[PDB]
Scaffold this active site. Sequence first.
Site, PDB file in Angstrom:
ATOM      1  N   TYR A   1       0.737  -1.257   0.000  1.00  0.00           N
ATOM      2  CA  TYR A   1       0.000   0.000   0.000  1.00  0.00           C
ATOM      3  C   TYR A   1       0.771   1.315   0.000  1.00  0.00           C
ATOM      4  O   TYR A   1       0.238   2.325  -0.422  1.00  0.00           O
ATOM      5  CB  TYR A   1      -0.980  -0.001   1.176  1.00  0.00           C
ATOM      6  CG  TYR A   1      -2.139  -0.948   0.987  1.00  0.00           C
ATOM      7  CD1 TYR A   1      -3.301  -0.537   0.333  1.00  0.00           C
ATOM      8  CD2 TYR A   1      -2.057  -2.273   1.420  1.00  0.00           C
ATOM      9  CE1 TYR A   1      -4.355  -1.424   0.114  1.00  0.00           C
ATOM     10  CE2 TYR A   1      -3.102  -3.165   1.203  1.00  0.00           C
ATOM     11  CZ  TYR A   1      -4.246  -2.734   0.550  1.00  0.00           C
ATOM     12  OH  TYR A   1      -5.274  -3.618   0.326  1.00  0.00           O
TER      13      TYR A   1
ATOM     14  N   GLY B   1       2.707   4.022  -1.452  1.00  0.00           N
ATOM     15  CA  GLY B   1       3.111   4.474  -2.772  1.00  0.00           C
ATOM     16  C   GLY B   1       2.131   3.967  -3.812  1.00  0.00           C
ATOM     17  O   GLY B   1       0.922   4.127  -3.661  1.00  0.00           O
TER      18      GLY B   1
ATOM     19  N   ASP C   1      -4.932   5.147   2.258  1.00  0.00           N
ATOM     20  CA  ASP C   1      -5.540   4.924   0.947  1.00  0.00           C
ATOM     21  C   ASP C   1      -7.064   4.992   1.060  1.00  0.00           C
ATOM     22  O   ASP C   1      -7.726   5.690   0.294  1.00  0.00           O
ATOM     23  CB  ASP C   1      -5.154   3.543   0.420  1.00  0.00           C
ATOM     24  CG  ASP C   1      -3.964   3.583  -0.509  1.00  0.00           C
ATOM     25  OD1 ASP C   1      -3.161   4.538  -0.424  1.00  0.00           O
ATOM     26  OD2 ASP C   1      -3.831   2.644  -1.321  1.00  0.00           O
TER      27      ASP C   1
ATOM     28  N   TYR D   1      -8.454   8.472   1.662  1.00  0.00           N
ATOM     29  CA  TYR D   1      -8.506   9.296   0.452  1.00  0.00           C
ATOM     30  C   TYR D   1      -9.728   8.931  -0.383  1.00  0.00           C
ATOM     31  O   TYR D   1     -10.355   9.799  -0.994  1.00  0.00           O
ATOM     32  CB  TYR D   1      -7.245   9.093  -0.393  1.00  0.00           C
ATOM     33  CG  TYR D   1      -6.123  10.080  -0.127  1.00  0.00           C
ATOM     34  CD1 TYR D   1      -6.046  10.793   1.075  1.00  0.00           C
ATOM     35  CD2 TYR D   1      -5.115  10.269  -1.067  1.00  0.00           C
ATOM     36  CE1 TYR D   1      -4.981  11.671   1.329  1.00  0.00           C
ATOM     37  CE2 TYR D   1      -4.051  11.132  -0.827  1.00  0.00           C
ATOM     38  CZ  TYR D   1      -3.987  11.828   0.369  1.00  0.00           C
ATOM     39  OH  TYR D   1      -2.912  12.653   0.592  1.00  0.00           O
TER      40      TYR D   1
END
Length: 119
Positions: free
Chosen positions: A27, A29, A48, A51
Amino acid sequence: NIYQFKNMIECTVPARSWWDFADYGCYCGGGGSGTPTDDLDRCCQVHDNCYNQAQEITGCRPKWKTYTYQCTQGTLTCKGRNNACAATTCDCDRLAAICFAGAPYNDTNYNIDLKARCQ
């Protein structure tokens, strides 16, 4: 935005180059799937997901939204002048930066083969 997130990381983890977090596990990058390899990778998975939630707000683009924050004397703060979108992504970034500082960094999980190990 990503520039600010990078600075938050430099704010909370001075002993490491932010690049070390740009390609870690499944996860951190690129890539956003599979089973998190460890605690640090779990920090990135949560970021992630955060977002993805923020992008449900009309016209909210996490990677590009410029928010208001401060980093001084060991304290990271999202200011009160942020609109709903800015406030949400700033918080996502702040929580991840804090998560990074308390998670162990295993060099063996850096730049792993996403296509083979993150299914």
